[PDB]
Symmetry: D2
Subunit: 33 residues, 4 copies
């Protein structure tokens, strides 16, 4: 379920530090700009 | 370190569709601009 | 919080096949 | 991939204390108890 996985990802994002979000953002940008 | 959480998030992005990544991006922008 | 991580884990268990849940169960058993 | 998610979950178990793993174990019993 993409809805279920997205919910889990959202919960986990809040446990990441600002520096970690750089890498998440980069992965997103490589997929959808 | 946050490396376990970052690993899990990065792994799970591969289970999400392109349209789902937009929501992750919004949550990142909410925090770091 | 650690609680937020726990709830993410619980949600992800619903994505796993029975055989992968056995693997998780075994790791938990060896820890506790 | 189910194995992809499995290894994500395994990494996250390292962020949990033994006390928290009890709830994970109980959830697993709801899903594959007796199997
Ligand atoms: Ca938000």
């Amino acid at each position: 379920s993409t809805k279920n996985i997205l919910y889990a990802v959202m919960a986990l994002l809040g446990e990441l530090e600002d520096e970690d979000l750089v890498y998440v953002r980069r992965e997103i940008e490589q997929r959808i700009g």
